[PDB]
């Protein structure tokens, strides 16, 4: 459920690497058999793509920056 710290920074590295929020290629680079490695082994496409939403939000909502991976995360983000 709750997510490591880990994993958060694994996000960001993959969105900054991917150039964009292309789901399936931060699992090649960290998802099961990930080329990095396996952090984001247990979070499918769905779990990153609201990841990275909530954490967009939660730097909105607390004012703090947003980092330059998650800009390329726009539109609308409320849970499901």
């Given at each position: 459920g709750s997510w490591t710290k880990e994993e958060e920074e694994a996000l960001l590295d993959?969105?900054?690497l991917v150039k964009g929020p292309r789901w399936?290629?931060?699992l090649?680079?960290?998802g099961p058999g990930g080329k990095?490695?396996?952090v984001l082994k247990?979070?499918?496409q769905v779990q990153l793509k609201d990841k990275?939403?909530?954490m967009k939000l939660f730097f909105?909502?607390?004012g703090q920056v947003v980092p330059a991976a998650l800009q390329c995360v726009t539109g609308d983000l409320?849970?499901?």
């Open positions: 993959g969105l900054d399936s290629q931060i090649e680079l960290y990095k490695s396996e247990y979070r499918n990275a939403r909530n909105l909502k607390s409320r849970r499901d």
